[PDB]
Structure formats: C-alpha cells, structure tokens
Amino acid sequence: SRKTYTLTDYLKNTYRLKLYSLRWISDHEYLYKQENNILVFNAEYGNSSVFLENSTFDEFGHSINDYSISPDGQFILLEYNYVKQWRHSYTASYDIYDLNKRQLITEERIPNNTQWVTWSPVGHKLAYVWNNDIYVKIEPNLPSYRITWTGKEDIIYNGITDWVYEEEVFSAYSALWWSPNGTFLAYAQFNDTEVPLIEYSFYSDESLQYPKTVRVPYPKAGAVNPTVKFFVVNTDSLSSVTNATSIQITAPASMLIGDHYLCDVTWATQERISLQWLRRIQNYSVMDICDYDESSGRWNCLVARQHIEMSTTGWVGRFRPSEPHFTLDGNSFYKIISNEEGYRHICYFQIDKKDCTFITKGTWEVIGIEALTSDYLYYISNEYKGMPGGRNLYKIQLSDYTKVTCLSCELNPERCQYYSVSFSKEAKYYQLRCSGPGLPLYTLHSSVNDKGLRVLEDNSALDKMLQNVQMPSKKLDFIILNETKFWYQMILPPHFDKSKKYPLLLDVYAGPCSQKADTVFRLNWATYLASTENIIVASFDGRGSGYQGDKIMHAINRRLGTFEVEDQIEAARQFSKMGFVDNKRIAIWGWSYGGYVTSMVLGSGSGVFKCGIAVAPVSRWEYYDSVYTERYMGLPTPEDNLDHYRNSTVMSRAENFKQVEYLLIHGTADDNVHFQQSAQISKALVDVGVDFQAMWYTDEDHGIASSTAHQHIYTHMSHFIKQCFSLP
Amino acid sequence: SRKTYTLTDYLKNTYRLKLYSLRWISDHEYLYKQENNILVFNAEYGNSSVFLENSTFDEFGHSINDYSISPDGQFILLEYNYVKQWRHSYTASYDIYDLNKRQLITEERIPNNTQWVTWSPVGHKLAYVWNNDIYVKIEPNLPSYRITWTGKEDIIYNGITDWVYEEEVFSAYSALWWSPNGTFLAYAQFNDTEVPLIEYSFYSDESLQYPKTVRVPYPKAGAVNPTVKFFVVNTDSLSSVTNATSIQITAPASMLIGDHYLCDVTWATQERISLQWLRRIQNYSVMDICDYDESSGRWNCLVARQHIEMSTTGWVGRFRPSEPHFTLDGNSFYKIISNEEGYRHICYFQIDKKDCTFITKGTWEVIGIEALTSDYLYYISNEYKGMPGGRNLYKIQLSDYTKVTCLSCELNPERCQYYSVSFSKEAKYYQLRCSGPGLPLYTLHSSVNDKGLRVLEDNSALDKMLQNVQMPSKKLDFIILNETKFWYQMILPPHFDKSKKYPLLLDVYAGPCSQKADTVFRLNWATYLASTENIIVASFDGRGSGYQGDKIMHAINRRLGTFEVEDQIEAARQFSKMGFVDNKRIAIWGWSYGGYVTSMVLGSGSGVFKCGIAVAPVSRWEYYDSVYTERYMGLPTPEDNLDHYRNSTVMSRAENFKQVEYLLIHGTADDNVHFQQSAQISKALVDVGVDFQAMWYTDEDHGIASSTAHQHIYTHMSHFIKQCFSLP
Numbered sequence A, B: 001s002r003k004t005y006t007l008t009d010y011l012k013n014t015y016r017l018k019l020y021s022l023r024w025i026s027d028h029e030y031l032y033k034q035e036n037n038i039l040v041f042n043a044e045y046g047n048s049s050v051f052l053e054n055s056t057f058d059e060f061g062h063s064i065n066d067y068s069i070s071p072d073g074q075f076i077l078l079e080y081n082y083v084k085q086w087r088h089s090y091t092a093s094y095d096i097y098d099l100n101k102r103q104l105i106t107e108e109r110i111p112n113n114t115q116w117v118t119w120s121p122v123g124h125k126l127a128y129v130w131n132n133d134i135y136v137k138i139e140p141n142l143p144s145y146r147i148t149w150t151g152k153e154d155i156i157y158n159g160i161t162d163w164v165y166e167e168e169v170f171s172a173y174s175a176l177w178w179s180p181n182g183t184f185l186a187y188a189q190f191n192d193t194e195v196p197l198i199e200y201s202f203y204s205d206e207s208l209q210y211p212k213t214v215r216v217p218y219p220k221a222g223a224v225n226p227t228v229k230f231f232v233v234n235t236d237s238l239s240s241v242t243n244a245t246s247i248q249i250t251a252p253a254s255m256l257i258g259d260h261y262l263c264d265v266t267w268a269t270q271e272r273i274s275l276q277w278l279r280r281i282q283n284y285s286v287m288d289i290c291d292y293d294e295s296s297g298r299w300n301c302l303v304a305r306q307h308i309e310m311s312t313t314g315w316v317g318r319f320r321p322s323e324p325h326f327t328l329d330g331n332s333f334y335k336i337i338s339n340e341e342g343y344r345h346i347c348y349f350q351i352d353k354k355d356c357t358f359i360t361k362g363t364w365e366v367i368g369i370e371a372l373t374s375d376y377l378y379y380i381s382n383e384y385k386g387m388p389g390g391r392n393l394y395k396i397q398l399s400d401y402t403k404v405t406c407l408s409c410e411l412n413p414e415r416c417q418y419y420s421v422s423f424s425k426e427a428k429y430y431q432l433r434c435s436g437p438g439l440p441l442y443t444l445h446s447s448v449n450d451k452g453l454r455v456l457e458d459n460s461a462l463d464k465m466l467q468n469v470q471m472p473s474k475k476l477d478f479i480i481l482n483e484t485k486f487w488y489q490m491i492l493p494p495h496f497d498k499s500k501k502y503p504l505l506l507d508v509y510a511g512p513c514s515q516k517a518d519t520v521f522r523l524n525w526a527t528y529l530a531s532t533e534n535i536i537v538a539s540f541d542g543r544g545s546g547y548q549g550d551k552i553m554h555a556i557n558r559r560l561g562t563f564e565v566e567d568q569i570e571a572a573r574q575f576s577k578m579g580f581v582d583n584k585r586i587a588i589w590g591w592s593y594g595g596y597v598t599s600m601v602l603g604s605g606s607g608v609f610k611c612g613i614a615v616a617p618v619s620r621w622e623y624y625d626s627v628y629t630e631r632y633m634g635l636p637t638p639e640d641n642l643d644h645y646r647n648s649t650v651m652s653r654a655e656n657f658k659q660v661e662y663l664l665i666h667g668t669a670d671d672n673v674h675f676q677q678s679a680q681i682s683k684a685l686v687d688v689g690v691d692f693q694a695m696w697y698t699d700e701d702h703g704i705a706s707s708t709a710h711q712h713i714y715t716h717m718s719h720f721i722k723q724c725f726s727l728p
C-alpha cells in the first residue's frame, strides 16, 4: 500500500489506537471523559450530558493529573504534584472540590505527599495514608482521624504495600479495604524491619555533585520477608476525644508455623470479610471467613468455614490464590480452582460446607469471573474454537449449570477473538471491548436479553489510516512437540512470499504462566521490523506457559531456566526447517523474564542463533525477589533447592557466548531486576574473554520508559539487528 | 615477510623488556635479586655475595609479595597477604627475620592488616601504622610503643594519607618521615571528618547476594577538604607506660588564614626540617624551616627564614611545589623554580638569605635534581639538541656554574636519548637507565672520572627476537602553530610508503603538563595498530603541555577544555595535509584527561574525526577531586570560575555527537574518576537522540587493570577501530 510502518512511527506514535475507558457510577450510568469534558451517559437510552467542564478548573494553579468523584457525585477529588515511585505506588497532592457550590474546600486539606487516597464505595468518606499512617475523614471539610501511629519510613507500612507486596502480591500500592457499607475500614500492616536493603546509585541532574544512594527493603530469594498483620476499624464509631480501636484479625494457626503472606482481601457483606493466606512455600493457602459480632465489637473466624487450597504439582493459583466472587446474601461464593485434571474452572463453595462443586469443566480454562446476578454468573474463558490465545464472554444459568451462552463469540468472528468486559453495578449492562485480531471495537449491551445497544468506538479513523500502510499480517497456528500442541504467532512482512527467505527474530518472554501467542492486535516494535525490515518476528508459548492447564504450566516447577529455555530453541529449530526462514539469520530478544531466557538461550551451544538482545535480564535467581522466585523455585537452601539455583545461572554458560553476538542492556536505576544481575553477566563474559556489546541507561528503571530513553533503546536495538542481519 | 606485532603479542606480553632494579646500600654497594637470591654487589670491582638465599622461606606457608632489609644489617621484613587499596595504598601482614639466626621473631609481631611499615634510615627501628594509628619498635622483638590514639577509620589518618593526599599530594600512602639519625619521627595527621562521601556499588563474586556499598571520603571540586596537622616525635625517649609526646608544627600564619595543603616534608640535617605548605588556591606556596631546640624540646621555624613562591601565570610547580635538595651542612639548598622567562631551572638559596641564584638558564628545562655533593650537582634536562622530549644526565661543578658536562649524551646518540639515573650514597657511583629510543640500556659508572664500568642489562635478548618481527618505526618531529614549535610523534607502520594514504589514530592525553611526544621505546597497543593494522598512531603536545616553559604550560590556566582541544584538532588537520594520511579515516582516543579531551574534540563539530573512544573520561570538572581540578580551575563558585566550569563539560556538546561515532568505556569501581562522570555523558547523549557505543566494566577501577579486563577492553577497542576504518 506504498507507505511502510516505520521506526519513527512506533516511537512517535503516528497511529494511536482509540479506547473507551468508562467508569460506571451505578446500575445504568457511566462517566466518560471526552478530551477534557467529563460526561455522564445513560446506558439504557444512550442520552448523556456535561457533568463537569474541561474549563471548570482553569484558575486552580496546578496542572491536574486525575480526578476521583465521590460515589454520590457530591465531591470531586483533584490529584496534583504527582511524583511516581515503583510500578503502582506514587505520591500526590490533593484537593476536594464541592460540586453543590462553586468551591474548593479550604479547611483541613489532605496533606502533600499522600501515598494513597480513596473514597468509600458509598457516600463521601475518605481514607488516606500519610507518612506510612492511615487517616480517616467522614466529612471532606472536617479534621481527619488517625488510625495508626506505628508508621515509619521503610520499616512499618500501615495501609500501604512495601516493595514485594506492591509488585508480587497485591498488584497495588493499596492495602486499604472499605466494607460496602462504608462502615468498616480494613487494612494490612507490614513490618519491614529486618528486610535487607538493595542499594544502588541514582545520579540525578547533572548539577548533582555527588550521586545519591537509593536504599530499598527488598527480600531477594531466601532472605527475610516482611511480616504482615490485619485489622478492622469502625468508621461510624470514631471518637475525636479518644484514640481509635483497630481490631486485629490474626492468621490461621496453620499459617503461624512459619513465614507466610496475606495474599487476598475480599469483603462479602456489610459484616463479613474473606481473607486469604499463603504459606512461604507457596503450595498451601487458607481462606478464612470472618463475621462481625455486634455485641462484643469483635471479629471471629470460625474454623468451620476455613477452606484450603494446596497444589500437589506446583503452586496455588496462577500467580496467587484466585479471587472469590460472593453471592449477595453472603453464604456462598464462586472461585476458580485447578480441577482434578489440572485445568482451571469455576468452583462453587458454600460457607459451612465441605469441598466444592465445579460448574465448568473441559480442556480449556476460565480466565476470570466477571459478574454475578441471581440467575447467572458471567465469566471470560478461552473455550471458543479451542484457542488458548482467545478470550470470550460466557454466561451460565445458575439453576442449571449445563446452560451456557456465548455472549461474544458470534458478534464479529473475523475482527474479534479477544474480549474483556466491564459490567454495570448489579450487572444490568456491560461494555464489551474487543482487542483483536482486528482493530479494538468498544460496544455496549444489556444483560436483560443480551441486546447490542450501541457501538461506542470502532477505530474507523485509524482503520482508514492503516489502509495507506503496508501493514504486517499476523499468523497464529501451533506446533506439536510430544503429543502436545504449543502455540506460536508470527508477525509477517507485507506482500509476504513463502517462496522467499526471511530473517527471524524470536520474541520471547516465556516466564511462568505467560502467553505471547495471542489474537490481540498490537502496534509495536515488532510491527516495524516486519513492515519496514521484512523481518519475521515470531513468539512461542511452550512449557510453563499459562491457560493450558497445570501439565504445561507446572512443567517448570522448582526448575526455571530448563524447559522454557529448551523449548524456545526447539520452536526455532522448527521455524528454521520451514522454507521461508533463512537459518543463518535467526535472532532472539527479551525483556525481564524474557531477557533471562534469551541469555540462557544464547549460552546454550544451540548452533541456532546468530545473535540476540537481552534487556534488564535476570541472571541468577538468588538476586531476584522472594515472593516471585520462591513461588517457582523453593528456597536456596541445601536441603530444599540450592542445587538448581546454582545450575541455572547466566554466568555458568558464559563460555558459550563465544559462538554468538550478544547485546546486553540495563537501566542503572532498576529497583526491580537490579543492575547487579547484568553486572554479574558482564563480569563472567569478561573473566572468560568473550566479546559482546553493551548499553546502560543511567537513571532508567525496569521499564526504560522515559520518552527519550525509550526512543534510544529501540534505535540501538534496531541498528544491532539490522547490522546482525546485513540490512541496509 | 616476517611475522607482525599482534594484539596477542601485546596482551600476553610475548616480547618482554628485561630490567635491572637495584637499591644502593652505601656509597659502594647495592642490592639485587638474581634467580630469587638477594645479592649485594660491589660497584667498584663487579663482585657479588649472596645476601639472602633463594632457598630460605621455601617453607614459609605464605607467598611473599615484597621483602625489605634493615639499613644496618641484621633484620629483614617479610611482606605477605597484600591487599590493594588505591594507587599506592594497601594492607598487608609482616614477619621479621633475624639474620644472625635461622629465625623468624615469634613474639610481638607486626599486626595483620597493617597500613604502612618503615625501617628508619639507620639501624633496625620500626615505625608502623595500623588502624590509622602510629606505632614504634626500638628493636624488632620488643613491644612497640603507641604514638597516636586518635586514628578512626575513614576519619582520622595518622602517618597515612587519605584519598586526595595519596592521589594528588604525596603520590604515597606513607605520611611518615624519619630524621637521618632515626632519632625523630615526623608524621602528618589528616582529618576528613566533614569531607563528603562518594559511594558506589561493588558487586563482588557472583555469590554475593546483596551488593556492598563502598563509601570513600572524597572532596570534589569546591567540597569541604581534609585538614592536616603536622607532628615530630623523639623516638629516643619512649616510655613503656607514659604516652609519647608529639610536638606539633604549626602551619605558617599565611596558610592558617584559609584552606591549605601540606605538600612537602624534607629533613635537612639531624635537627632541621623543611616543610612546604600550599594554599588551597594553588597560587601561593611557603617553605618553612624548623630547627630543634635541645633545651626546650620544641621545634621553631623562624619567620625571617620562610621562603615564598608565587605565580600570576598559573600554579606553583609542575604539579605541586618542587623539592628542595639541601647541602650537607643544611644552610643552603638547590631547588627547581620557574624563572623570569617562564623556564624551569635550578636555583641556589641560602637559608638566612632571601633570594636565589640561577645556576642554569636556557630555552629548555630541568626535569629533576638527581644528586648533590661538595663538588658536583647532577641533574636531568631536555637540553640536548633542543629536543624537549628527551632526557639527559648533566653535571655542574659548583666552584664554576658554567662548567657543565653532559654524561649521557654521547653514550650511544642513535640508541640512547632518554635517561633516568640512580646514585649510590655520596654520589660515588651511578646507574644509568636509557629508556629509548632504542631498547633500554642499563649501565654502571664511576663518579671520579665519569668512567664506564660495566653493562648491567642490554636487552640483547629482546633485540634478537625483535629482528624477527615487522616493527613499526617512530617519527618524532614538530609543527608550527602561531610561530611556536609543537611536537608530535607518529608510530609508523613498517615499509611506510609516503605516497600511500594511511589511516590515523590520534593518541591523546593532553592534561596540564603532559608529554605524549617523546624519545621513549614502548611496546604497546599503538605498536600493534601500526605493525598489523597499518594505522599511524600519532600523538601531539599542544598548549598546556609541559617541559617547554610556562608560556605553553600555563596557556590553559583557569580554562581547561579549551586550547588543549583546539590544538589537538589543528594537529589532526595538519596531519590531513600530508599525502600519507587519508582524511576520511581519522580516529581519536584517550584515557582519564585523554577521554575528556577525546570527548570534547568529538563534540566540537570540527567534523575532522570519523570516530573516537573515551576511556573513563572526566565529563564535568565539578565531579573530579578538589586538589587536581582547583589547581588548574580555581573554585566553582560564582566569585571564581563557575562560568568556565560550566562552559567546559562534555555534556554541553551532546548534539554534535550526531556527526561522530562514539565509544564510551568506564569501569564501575572507579574510585578516582567516578562512574557518575560517564553516566552523565550517556544521559546527555540519550536526552538528545544520539546513537553510540558503550561498555561498563563491573567492579574494575580507573586502570581497568586486571588481567581479564585488560585483555577485554583492548579487544573491544580494536574491533571498534578496525571497523571504523574498513579494516577487516
């Protein structure tokens, strides 16, 4: 189509995908920002209005970064002075504006450097975290109420996660939890006291004479973990003459035996809380169900309703114990479990009863549970057409499980195989957002009798543009290795010719429970290599990958750097055989777990790879964190799994890089995979005298994501593959 | 048709340069190790006796790093467990061997981890420093007495120097100096209590889980500096029970008004010390002369006896103020002073007089005073043939200063033009080492009639071998810039063909008072690029280089990054306009100051260079140490030189790097020139979208010196250069 998808295009975002992030405020209303206007839409009639103008906050004085309107549209929250921290954490300054007046509140302002703020899910209450301590405001313009006093930088964490808990448990800086009533604030408290500190330089502005030493409590594999406690406080009982009484919930006796984690917090009623707990060795979780006791002010967790999950083949859950979805009354829940055959399905649990009944069964898995009315449970799975790369909305009749209706399979079979959904409060309606293989297609429906109300976004604008570009095409078959199908994808060059011979970059992640072979439509770096460089970028989902059941996913257990590695090689050795790939020119790249694998791949003696880039890789498991690593690897002790911690380093293969061209990249200020692991790689490559190219990004963290640095890495990498391939 | 000088040859040191290290013991004998024996030789008749048999300590249990024998006979020190700190500093363990018995001393040993040890200049007394505190041994089997009790790690330094003093002041760990008697023991104290700390990671063996943060007190340009007191102890009054009395020597009033350094300590007679102090603004220097008072037990430095050095032109001395050589009676001394015409020549000062008398004059400079007698002074200059880049030994009779003989000039004018020298006590004999342009020659001579005696080592072994390889030849000549001669050398490929058009590598250092163009014979990396890769490696001494008088050296005063850079460019251009250098292939590289300049050049826009390599550069003067930088730049305050400190950063020039190909190398443990510096450069080159090559070296320091890192960095640099030049 004459023009080509270009490196600058990718880097400078010539072609933006349109989205439709709506926020539901009820059973039949969502909020939507249009450029800078905030609009409320009626889902039923499609009619809408200006809720808040883009102009309303012009004489405010600080660039506004986000809003958060109270769940009664009474007050709006204004987030400014945003300073980022790790992957979710940050600090920000806040203001509360009253919507029934033309007025910001002057009195008792939320203080600067707030680590976290949140409305109640009803009315206009606030919890915030300032200096690792929890505060509470009934009324926006009232003195706040302190709830903790134990907080201490880097040592005591009240209502907020420490590093491990942010990245590897809760996927959230948040460790607060309102009861639906807004009555009860529940919260976690972490004790980071004897957690060793990762240390590294941050150089900052040129003007900074001496570089600063950044120090973060970070348990690497085998070190001391943070400890956790749980508490529930009662907001309606708060006195300002008196201190507040948290009530400690303690953990199941069978957890206190040794180290453990609080992994899941789900409220169930106005008065019932569900806590989950994971043993340090992550194959034993225990759910507890705790009820308020209006007479004694206590919380009680009866053993009778305690439940247990324990993996016998690997670890519990995909990355953790599943979320349990609770039927309205509070006496039953559904939650995804590994069935007896290894596949993950919806399971039905009744509070004081034994076992659970499974409502779904088969050679596919459920991805998640999305909503629960009284007649139906709604859920996403990968059942359709046996595509583990796919995702679709399903609906189950509760009074007969066998009655399932695929709400999404058939709406657009050619453009659509990957969905996600956003149910309205009480599930009267839902936004369906398709993600490929064609352009993102945002629709809106009603559960009643599933009636397609309205298209909300179709990317027509982008669809017109992309017609001028000689786009790559995406292939998505699978190979057989033993008797098993493992899936792979190929981003193919325009005017593809299976007669010709093409360079192949093997794009890897391949960590535990990964999926790099899907139907999602993506505009990215691989999009460029293919369109402009006629380079076949393949990916492959082999042993240890997700969504195909424990036999594949758990093949990797206590054994990283083994199967996942070999199998990438294998996939290549297959691709090679195929008539359109020139084997003298096969490459491999990867970031995070992916960069780990690539390096291991290159140091394997395979013969199959000319070159590869590896980006901020892991090099030795003892360097990466406890919660993630030990989930997969056990403990680095002689009596547990030390041997294999030592068999699976990048360092011990070093000699083999003699036979390949290697580019290794790391951001100095990566709090996640520390520069250490790359630093150790280079030293070994040095000790043994092997040439390789390098690049550090002073101050860049794990993302290497600042717009300037981001452009730099893809440029550098683009030159490297272009040169490694003989590309002019 | 012979083989060629190859990277291997260089890296594995195939062709070795044999040496003749000796230590004069008296005016007639000297020590020498020969097949691991320690021998004493007679200078007069050639004959040698075995001082320490190679056999002894075959059974010591430890490998011995160095030995050291009492001046007066009877003991030898054994140095084992050496652990390198900085450039001169290190830690080790010691045993004493009593020569009048097959016996090591058992009792009262020197402690492990000792910081410094010294015999006194006569007898067998020991002065040692351990945990920053000074200890003295009257006999080696007796308990030592303790002199200082104040030493505290990274804070108070008794008898050893700290980082700046070590690196920039005494080129030494030792901050100890005995009287010639061995009666007194003067030592300096350093107080780094408020000196800021540079910190960087050390990653250690891949088995170290958590990176160690190294903290080194290191005053950066304009930072708080260490302070120094100075002391002298009578070692002939020591008591087993009552602490030792260190008499303090106070700096002069005109150093005590602001920050200052102690920068030279010479004993004159048994009872007289010479101290040179130096203001922090290195403009102004005082020498103080202190006699001992038999009655008072105190030390007095008569004011009227002070000797002041100024400079309007730059700083005092080549790198620090110069060293006084005293007459036997200690009422006069000779010392290298820059003269009226800017040239460094020899001056005769009388203690209780105030001016001096120049004893040499000319359009050449004195490099060093080598030996003084009742009759003769001996020195080294670059007078011969007006070749500032060569060195000869000369001789003045003191009864007539015009009566001057050269002693080395005519030994072999084709072979030898770069001497150093080594005189027995009372300059009765001397050893001459010629370092080029031929293979080094080591001779022994008689002072009486300046007669030839014996050839020590003549490297005839190397000569045999070199006859089998295609060695590059050297051109050492000059060019004219604004009516001034400036010198360069070229390392020319064999069978040089002036009508062919060779590629040029510019080898730069160019720091204040450097000299890259000279008559010495090196077997190095230039050798290989010339002999194998047919690359002219050329060096050039532009403005700010030394040994040619102050007009050239001080041109750079207060303005580094400027003329030394223009003048490097200019050189390259004139190398262009020679019919043997192809201008499309001009590279440049350097280390330390070499890299600052390489970097500054590459980013000047001259577009006269295709590519360069900067190894551990400075990048902003505010990052480098106070003593060095402020010598040539003054302070980085707005009242001083802040403006220029800013004008002269690598960073300001990131844009031009678009033109050139860059390769930024640095080790991560660089205590000297901190990684910070290169980190800031690449952050600049990223901020503005310039591709470039880089290479960190894990845990290496400024000299990237370890066997594996040395072999590597040179490999890497060779790939980059050959490819820069279309050389396969």
Ligand SMILES: COc1ccc(N2CC[C@H](N)[C@H](c3cccc(C)c3)C2)cc1OC
Pocket (backbone or CB within 6 Å): A167, A168, A511, A592, A593, A618, A624, A628, A672, A673
């Ligand atoms: C929100 O986007 C996320 C969240 C988590 C996330 N991972 C969380 C679990 C692991 N920490 C994972 C990872 C990062 C770095 C190295 C390794 C081995 C694994 C990274 C990745 C990610 O996008 C790539």
Ligand SMILES: COc1ccc(N2CC[C@H](N)[C@H](c3cccc(C)c3)C2)cc1OC
Pocket (backbone or CB within 6 Å): B167, B168, B511, B592, B593, B618, B628, B672, B673, B702
């Ligand atoms: C023995 O070899 C030495 C000794 C000292 C020495 N210098 C000591 C004085 C200065 N610190 C000098 C220097 C200037 C600028 C930058 C750097 C890193 C070093 C380096 C250099 C050197 O070889 C190059």
Ligand SMILES: *[C@@H]1O[C@H](CO)[C@@H](O)[C@H](O)[C@H]1NC(C)=O
Pocket (backbone or CB within 6 Å): A150, A156, A191, A192, A193, A194
């Ligand atoms: C945190 O833990 C340490 C020891 O692990 C303990 O001494 C300290 O008091 C604890 N603090 C709190 C408030 O939990």
Ligand SMILES: *[C@@H]1O[C@H](CO)[C@@H](O)[C@H](O)[C@H]1NC(C)=O
Pocket (backbone or CB within 6 Å): B040, B041, B042, B045, B047, B048, B049
């Ligand atoms: C050299 O020989 C003479 C005569 O025997 C002797 O006195 C002298 O000690 C010898 N020199 C050495 C090195 O011992």
Ligand SMILES: *[C@@H]1O[C@H](CO)[C@@H](O)[C@H](O)[C@H]1NC(C)=O
Pocket (backbone or CB within 6 Å): B093, B109, B110, B111, B112
């Ligand atoms: C010194 O080191 C040795 C080990 O080499 C040890 O036996 C000795 O006790 C140490 N301590 C002393 C004597 O300072």
Ligand SMILES: *[C@H]1O[C@H](CO)[C@@H](O)[C@H](O)[C@H]1NC(C)=O
Pocket (backbone or CB within 6 Å): B035, B036, B037, B054, B055
């Ligand atoms: C030590 O000296 C002897 C004879 O003096 C020499 O021949 C031998 O090779 C040497 N051996 C050692 C221990 O180096």
